[PDB]
Amino acid sequence: DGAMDAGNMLKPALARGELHCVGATTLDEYRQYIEKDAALERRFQKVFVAEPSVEDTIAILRGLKERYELHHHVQITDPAIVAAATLSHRYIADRQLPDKAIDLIDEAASSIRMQIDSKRLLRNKVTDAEIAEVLARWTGIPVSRMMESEREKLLRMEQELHHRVIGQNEAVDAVSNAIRRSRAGLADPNRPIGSFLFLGPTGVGKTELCKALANFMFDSDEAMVRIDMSEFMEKHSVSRLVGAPPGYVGYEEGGYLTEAVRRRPYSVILLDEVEKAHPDVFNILLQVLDDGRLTDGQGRTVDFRNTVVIMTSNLGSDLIQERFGELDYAHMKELVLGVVSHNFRPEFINRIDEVVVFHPLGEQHIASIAQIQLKRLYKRLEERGYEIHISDEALKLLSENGYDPVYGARPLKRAIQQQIENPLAQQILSGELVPGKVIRLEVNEDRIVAVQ
Amino acid sequence: LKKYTIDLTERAEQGKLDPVIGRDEEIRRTIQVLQRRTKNNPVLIGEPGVGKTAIVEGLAQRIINGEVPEGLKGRRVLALDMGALVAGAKYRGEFEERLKGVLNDLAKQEGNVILFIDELHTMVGAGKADGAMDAGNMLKPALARGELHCVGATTLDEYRQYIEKDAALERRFQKVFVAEPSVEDTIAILRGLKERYELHHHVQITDPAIVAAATLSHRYIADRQLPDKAIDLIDEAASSIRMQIDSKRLLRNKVTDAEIAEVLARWTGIPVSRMMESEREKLLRMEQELHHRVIGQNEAVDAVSNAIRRSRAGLADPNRPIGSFLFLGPTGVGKTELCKALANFMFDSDEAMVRIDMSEFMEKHSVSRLVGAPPGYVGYEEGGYLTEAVRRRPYSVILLDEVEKAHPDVFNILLQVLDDGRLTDGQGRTVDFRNTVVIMTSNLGSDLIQERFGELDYAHMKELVLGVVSHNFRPEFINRIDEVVVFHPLGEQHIASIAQIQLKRLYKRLEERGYEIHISDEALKLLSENGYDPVYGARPLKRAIQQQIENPLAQQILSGELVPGKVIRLEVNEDRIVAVQ
Amino acid sequence: LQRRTKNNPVLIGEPGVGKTAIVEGLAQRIINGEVPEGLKGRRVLALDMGALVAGAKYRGEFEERLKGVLNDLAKQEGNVILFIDELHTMVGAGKADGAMDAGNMLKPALARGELHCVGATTLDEYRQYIEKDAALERRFQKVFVAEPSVEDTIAILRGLKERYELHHHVQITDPAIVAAATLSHRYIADRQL
Ligand SMILES: Nc1ncnc2c1ncn2[C@@H]1O[C@H](COP(=O)(O)OP(=O)(O)OP(O)(O)=S)[C@@H](O)[C@H]1O
Ligand SMILES: Nc1ncnc2c1ncn2[C@@H]1O[C@H](COP(=O)(O)OP(=O)(O)OP(O)(O)=S)[C@@H](O)[C@H]1O
Ligand SMILES: Nc1ncnc2c1ncn2[C@@H]1O[C@H](COP(=O)(O)OP(=O)(O)OP(O)(O)=S)[C@@H](O)[C@H]1O
Ligand SMILES: Nc1ncnc2c1ncn2[C@@H]1O[C@H](COP(=O)(O)OP(=O)(O)OP(O)(O)=S)[C@@H](O)[C@H]1O
């Protein structure tokens, strides 16, 4: 109420030296509590304790190794000591280095002790192979050992992305190679896992590849940090990516890009239609794409160096579908990089690890996207109880009425919405197409409707 | 201790905790942190609804059933209530000795107590009556030494709001991320939890209702989690089934997939319920119900009714809006009348529409009233017009009137709205547009449709360009609108029918005043003679009605020459429409 | 109000629509027996946050009496429907110097179904207060109270004309009832119907 606090009562005894006080505040709690009382800050010689090296932490972890080996009854190997101070320095960003190396050492020791009690893979030894299993569970960044079940999944990464992105071989080979470079440990630890400029015509598979990439590593299309850059046409819209400065509304809410990657650092970032953004929004992504370190408005640096940043754009579109049938991919990428040299600054084009040119879909690709978009329709109809069978006569109606070389594979989905589902919804609604019987989609000579 | 903690492990002995299905790796990771030497305090961060409190309640049932490691056998999970810790704590040091009485009673348990602080961010500043912080700071030595075994459970955005501010306390807690489960992983959640909801409601929840509620709420509810938004479909369908058993041959018992869609359609408004009723007939005559208000435009009334029927059959692409139309055509032909007749069909109110008048977006910076200001700018809290109207009512008609009178890259912000059905505010809220009909009326090619619709069929009036520079100049906005309609110019046989539509609007304006109006078939023909201009559509008829009918009629209503009760008859006496009684 | 978990409904709408006059009309279905067998004899208690925060000067005094309400709502064996007019007031109420508000203390009891709470926020007081507390927004099922038609407002006004004829000792005619719902819907724009 009015009585004396502990600051003002030790203030005589601190200055006189009768009190040999040691404090251990943080740098932030010294500023907002002790440094605001400048008469009390006067009495306290601050000994700055720096965050140590990795090599200083391997010496720290080796000393209290036996204090954690005795509590968990495991033996922590020195490969696990070195790979806890190396891996936590790289992959943990919010924490500080003696501690976050001990958290890996302690929880890998705690998990081995779980694996002897709660059940050669029943043995009391913390190896570097399972410090990383704790860190891949801490962070989500798959730094684990990856023995054969996921090793076989991404040896077939291209034909698992070609289940959903038909054609675009040079693009599926570009993103599958960046995930193999990271998961073989060959990726540059400073830059992101991949930086991709997906150029190409419209409707051609370049946002489909990001949705199939995010489906590959996260089993959900909506498991990417999807950022539509056409909401960033204004120069002051970079406040949506990094957040508001201190003093301003929605400053506590943070950014959208930084706060999504600070939560899950192993992400896929889609920057859709990136040329529609203001040219000062790419300046935010300069520090994201090379030495990935986007900073909040709060001043929290976010490590983007475990993300796959994909920037899909529509820029060589007039030049790609005009010249792809007469150029190889080397001369075509050479010619579209001349077009995006006029849109993006050379600073920004130089950060991108792979500028990928998507080719316009031929008639034999759109005949195969017809199979995808119709199997999506059968799964949409077995939810309602109806069983559809397309004819091969009606498949080459949709692969010909849905083939427009300018507009990609969206006319085919539009042909499915118009001459498959538009008359089929009339007949599901009228009741004359009953479930249970297999619905056959034939052609009379030009178009006939479902028959059962 | 027992004054301030609820025992989750004796709640689990008595069966009062819900069964917890899945989360085998989020409970193993929260056990692995709890078995650490120092700083054994696992924090279950996640979105609100994902199952963070149910991990500790499924850890508490795991240390009872003995599916837990030794060392956690026989633990007590004690839910620390921090509203009870700061309850009577008026005087100084009354909270701080309550908190220390808990910490000293946790030390007498010899580490055989797991502490649960649900809503862990409420510990950050709980005493706080003198200056520097009390709880948090008082638990900070015990949390770092490894003496509490304190399981937290915060959301992701109350962790950064409250706990990441105290970076010394954020240190002491190991973030166990609790991801929102799959639609497949929450079917197994709802199956091992339906007996708790079959028993409270005295109903039967069928497994089709379990698969429906996980699938439908994942698709149709956007501001909800996983297990949380699928449970309250089977919880509120069962609550509604039990109401129509207890209150008013006439009493079903099962919760089926139809009752799940019936409560999701009352939640969201998106009509996902069932198409067996008398409203299945309303959609078969959608073109007849739209042609009571839109004369002609058959290739447009068919095209906007096919997309409603494609959604109600469940055939619509769930990743795009319901329809995405470009209504091209001349002036006064029924482009905005069809978007008004459609919202009058779907919502039975003409103004029940998110109509954006796109002739206010002639500047590029006007696009931020669709989505709102960014963080830090003025009007950021208000959100956008388009985003907050579709966040509230997700099943909408969005009319974008006169799109060609917008800035040519306001349509960039609709590239995600039409292809993907998403649009993000300045506040970072992604609004789903996948249940909207986005109609975009425009007057492009109006000089081309008025010139060539008699010469060409509709297939050629929609294209008819081999090498000419611009049918539509928009590059890749045009292939994500799913159906482009050319509206045709209204002939005299159409404007004879709009003459009767616009006169029935006039008859209702007069029967609200007590007057009863009769048109002759010659004054109807005289309106359709001089209300027919071809290049101006059907507004010169609405001018010919207000000039040749309503202008003498308003002068004769005010002068008392036409009193109510008697029938007013509009016939031609000389070549003019007079009103006689 | 009759589900197992998280049984907290809210008449979210616009100001004037009839949100407070649903819980005033649910509290009359309860007396007249026009509720199901689970709400027979229940009590709709209207918790005001202005009396809980009033005089809660000391540390704990808001917490003590809000926990005192929750301890006294539990003695009712679940027979009390709680009703918070202006539910956005709770989100932040009692906010001292870092301590949690009424929103965080009611968050365990709202999600378990111990509170059969009813909220009555508008659509934009829910958006700026409760929808920011995303874990409290979860505990509350949005019952969207739509603004009625003119044809539903003449039916409203016909039921209330006996209550306004009695306050003013005037006689309201049914043309005056139809005109007040038809003309205000057309000419008044700032209010809801
Ligand atoms: N190569 C492809 N393989 C399979 N489906 C495809 C392919 N290309 C397009 N599609 C389908 O067509 C839709 C539109 O293609 P997108 O790739 O999303 O458009 P886009 O490639 O981003 O081009 P823009 O510039 O955004 S119009 C996708 O959602 C798929 O369903
Ligand atoms: N794995 C699970 N098994 C069974 N029920 C679950 C599971 N996960 C969640 N639930 C239930 O789904 C609902 C989710 O609510 P809670 O998990 O208690 O809330 P929460 O996850 O703590 O999120 P907040 O931020 O505390 S509101 C509850 O009814 C849980 O019982
Ligand atoms: N085909 C029609 N059927 C019925 N009424 C019509 C028709 N066309 C026009 N009208 C009437 O005339 C008015 C003007 O037509 P609108 O459709 O609103 O203008 P528009 O045809 O959409 O073209 P604009 O000027 O470019 S917005 C409508 O409000 C109706 O009252
Ligand atoms: N369905 C209804 N039946 C009868 N009277 C009603 C109905 N809806 C509203 N009213 C009356 O119309 C007025 C509406 O006021 P309230 O319903 O109290 O305000 P509100 O809906 O709670 O909005 P606020 O300002 O956010 S409290 C009151 O006089 C009610 O008595």
PDB file of C-alpha atoms in Angstrom, chain B residues 11 18 48-49 81 83 86-96 119 121-122 124-129 134 155 158 196-197 200-201 223-224 228 232 235-236 239 242-243 246-247 267 381 388 391-393 427 429, chain C residues 1-6 14 35-38 58-61 63-65 67 95-101 104-105 107-108 112 123-124 126-128 131-142 144 178 182 187:
ATOM      1  CA  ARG B  11     -11.014 -38.194 -12.148  1.00  0.00           C
ATOM      2  CA  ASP B  18     -13.234 -38.895 -21.667  1.00  0.00           C
ATOM      3  CA  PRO B  48      -7.728 -24.209 -29.854  1.00  0.00           C
ATOM      4  CA  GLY B  49      -9.593 -27.463 -30.169  1.00  0.00           C
ATOM      5  CA  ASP B  81      -6.379 -24.233 -10.709  1.00  0.00           C
ATOM      6  CA  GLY B  83      -8.156 -19.018 -10.349  1.00  0.00           C
ATOM      7  CA  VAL B  86      -5.568 -16.108  -6.562  1.00  0.00           C
ATOM      8  CA  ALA B  87      -9.000 -16.347  -4.975  1.00  0.00           C
ATOM      9  CA  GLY B  88      -8.943 -14.851  -1.513  1.00  0.00           C
ATOM     10  CA  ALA B  89      -5.467 -13.428  -1.873  1.00  0.00           C
ATOM     11  CA  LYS B  90      -6.230  -9.863  -0.757  1.00  0.00           C
ATOM     12  CA  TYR B  91      -3.273  -9.218   1.521  1.00  0.00           C
ATOM     13  CA  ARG B  92       0.348  -9.110   0.508  1.00  0.00           C
ATOM     14  CA  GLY B  93       2.024 -12.487   0.383  1.00  0.00           C
ATOM     15  CA  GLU B  94      -1.267 -14.357   0.490  1.00  0.00           C
ATOM     16  CA  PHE B  95      -0.937 -15.626  -3.048  1.00  0.00           C
ATOM     17  CA  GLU B  96       2.803 -16.123  -2.589  1.00  0.00           C
ATOM     18  CA  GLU B 119      -4.239 -22.371 -19.701  1.00  0.00           C
ATOM     19  CA  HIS B 121      -0.522 -18.358 -19.914  1.00  0.00           C
ATOM     20  CA  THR B 122      -2.657 -17.530 -16.877  1.00  0.00           C
ATOM     21  CA  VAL B 124       2.255 -15.408 -16.395  1.00  0.00           C
ATOM     22  CA  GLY B 125       1.509 -12.638 -13.947  1.00  0.00           C
ATOM     23  CA  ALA B 126      -0.914 -14.315 -11.571  1.00  0.00           C
ATOM     24  CA  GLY B 127      -0.005 -12.631  -8.307  1.00  0.00           C
ATOM     25  CA  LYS B 128       1.335  -9.291  -9.575  1.00  0.00           C
ATOM     26  CA  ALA B 129       0.374  -6.773  -6.911  1.00  0.00           C
ATOM     27  CA  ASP B 134       4.766 -13.393  -8.845  1.00  0.00           C
ATOM     28  CA  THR B 155      -2.778 -22.209 -27.523  1.00  0.00           C
ATOM     29  CA  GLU B 158      -1.507 -17.302 -26.134  1.00  0.00           C
ATOM     30  CA  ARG B 196     -19.897 -40.945 -24.242  1.00  0.00           C
ATOM     31  CA  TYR B 197     -22.310 -38.996 -26.450  1.00  0.00           C
ATOM     32  CA  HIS B 200     -25.465 -38.537 -22.406  1.00  0.00           C
ATOM     33  CA  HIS B 201     -28.067 -38.089 -25.115  1.00  0.00           C
ATOM     34  CA  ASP B 223     -13.016 -21.104 -37.788  1.00  0.00           C
ATOM     35  CA  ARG B 224     -12.969 -24.389 -35.869  1.00  0.00           C
ATOM     36  CA  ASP B 228     -13.626 -29.967 -31.615  1.00  0.00           C
ATOM     37  CA  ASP B 232     -20.092 -30.675 -31.747  1.00  0.00           C
ATOM     38  CA  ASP B 235     -23.049 -33.538 -29.995  1.00  0.00           C
ATOM     39  CA  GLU B 236     -25.616 -31.120 -31.376  1.00  0.00           C
ATOM     40  CA  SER B 239     -28.942 -33.032 -28.677  1.00  0.00           C
ATOM     41  CA  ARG B 242     -33.091 -36.167 -28.101  1.00  0.00           C
ATOM     42  CA  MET B 243     -35.144 -32.945 -28.187  1.00  0.00           C
ATOM     43  CA  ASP B 246     -38.466 -35.902 -25.416  1.00  0.00           C
ATOM     44  CA  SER B 247     -40.450 -32.942 -26.760  1.00  0.00           C
ATOM     45  CA  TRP B 267     -24.433 -23.719 -38.067  1.00  0.00           C
ATOM     46  CA  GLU B 381      -9.606  -3.822 -37.006  1.00  0.00           C
ATOM     47  CA  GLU B 388     -16.201 -10.162 -43.346  1.00  0.00           C
ATOM     48  CA  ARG B 391     -16.812 -15.042 -43.124  1.00  0.00           C
ATOM     49  CA  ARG B 392     -20.196 -14.432 -41.504  1.00  0.00           C
ATOM     50  CA  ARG B 393     -22.416 -15.909 -44.227  1.00  0.00           C
ATOM     51  CA  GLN B 427      -5.776  -9.565 -40.084  1.00  0.00           C
ATOM     52  CA  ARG B 429      -7.964 -14.571 -41.532  1.00  0.00           C
TER      53      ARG B 429
ATOM     54  CA  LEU C   1     -28.005 -25.728 -24.151  1.00  0.00           C
ATOM     55  CA  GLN C   2     -28.648 -29.472 -24.049  1.00  0.00           C
ATOM     56  CA  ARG C   3     -25.448 -30.969 -25.334  1.00  0.00           C
ATOM     57  CA  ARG C   4     -22.857 -32.818 -23.325  1.00  0.00           C
ATOM     58  CA  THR C   5     -19.641 -30.888 -23.891  1.00  0.00           C
ATOM     59  CA  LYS C   6     -19.360 -27.157 -24.577  1.00  0.00           C
ATOM     60  CA  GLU C  14     -26.943  -7.181 -35.023  1.00  0.00           C
ATOM     61  CA  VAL C  35     -39.104 -26.499 -23.318  1.00  0.00           C
ATOM     62  CA  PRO C  36     -38.018 -30.167 -23.489  1.00  0.00           C
ATOM     63  CA  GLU C  37     -37.856 -32.415 -20.436  1.00  0.00           C
ATOM     64  CA  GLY C  38     -34.226 -31.425 -19.857  1.00  0.00           C
ATOM     65  CA  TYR C  58      -7.871  -5.973  -4.133  1.00  0.00           C
ATOM     66  CA  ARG C  59      -5.894  -8.816  -5.609  1.00  0.00           C
ATOM     67  CA  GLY C  60      -8.158 -11.781  -5.879  1.00  0.00           C
ATOM     68  CA  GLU C  61     -11.467 -10.070  -5.210  1.00  0.00           C
ATOM     69  CA  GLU C  63     -11.346 -14.010  -8.859  1.00  0.00           C
ATOM     70  CA  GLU C  64     -12.905 -14.814  -5.472  1.00  0.00           C
ATOM     71  CA  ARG C  65     -16.448 -13.910  -6.429  1.00  0.00           C
ATOM     72  CA  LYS C  67     -15.021 -18.550  -8.486  1.00  0.00           C
ATOM     73  CA  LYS C  95      -8.056  -7.913 -16.004  1.00  0.00           C
ATOM     74  CA  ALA C  96      -5.719  -6.726 -13.248  1.00  0.00           C
ATOM     75  CA  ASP C  97      -1.965  -6.538 -13.831  1.00  0.00           C
ATOM     76  CA  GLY C  98      -1.234  -9.690 -15.819  1.00  0.00           C
ATOM     77  CA  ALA C  99      -3.799 -11.943 -14.162  1.00  0.00           C
ATOM     78  CA  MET C 100      -6.335 -13.767 -16.332  1.00  0.00           C
ATOM     79  CA  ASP C 101      -9.783 -12.277 -16.930  1.00  0.00           C
ATOM     80  CA  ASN C 104      -9.818 -17.576 -18.700  1.00  0.00           C
ATOM     81  CA  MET C 105     -11.477 -18.613 -15.452  1.00  0.00           C
ATOM     82  CA  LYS C 107     -12.695 -21.446 -19.937  1.00  0.00           C
ATOM     83  CA  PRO C 108     -12.424 -24.770 -18.049  1.00  0.00           C
ATOM     84  CA  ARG C 112     -16.672 -29.051 -19.877  1.00  0.00           C
ATOM     85  CA  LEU C 123     -21.574  -9.662 -34.771  1.00  0.00           C
ATOM     86  CA  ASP C 124     -18.907  -6.998 -34.521  1.00  0.00           C
ATOM     87  CA  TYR C 126     -17.904 -10.811 -31.140  1.00  0.00           C
ATOM     88  CA  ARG C 127     -15.393 -10.198 -33.903  1.00  0.00           C
ATOM     89  CA  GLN C 128     -13.230  -7.728 -32.019  1.00  0.00           C
ATOM     90  CA  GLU C 131     -12.922 -13.952 -31.828  1.00  0.00           C
ATOM     91  CA  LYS C 132      -9.508 -12.687 -30.728  1.00  0.00           C
ATOM     92  CA  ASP C 133      -9.654 -15.021 -27.705  1.00  0.00           C
ATOM     93  CA  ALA C 134      -9.670 -17.998 -30.047  1.00  0.00           C
ATOM     94  CA  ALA C 135      -9.890 -20.541 -27.219  1.00  0.00           C
ATOM     95  CA  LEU C 136     -12.895 -18.786 -25.709  1.00  0.00           C
ATOM     96  CA  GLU C 137     -14.505 -18.332 -29.129  1.00  0.00           C
ATOM     97  CA  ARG C 138     -14.298 -22.125 -29.379  1.00  0.00           C
ATOM     98  CA  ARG C 139     -16.356 -22.642 -26.206  1.00  0.00           C
ATOM     99  CA  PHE C 140     -19.344 -20.843 -27.628  1.00  0.00           C
ATOM    100  CA  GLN C 141     -21.633 -22.037 -30.387  1.00  0.00           C
ATOM    101  CA  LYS C 142     -22.722 -19.121 -32.549  1.00  0.00           C
ATOM    102  CA  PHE C 144     -26.892 -16.565 -35.565  1.00  0.00           C
ATOM    103  CA  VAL C 178     -48.016  -2.852 -40.511  1.00  0.00           C
ATOM    104  CA  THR C 182     -43.006  -1.761 -43.580  1.00  0.00           C
ATOM    105  CA  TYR C 187     -36.721   4.392 -44.618  1.00  0.00           C
TER     106      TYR C 187
END
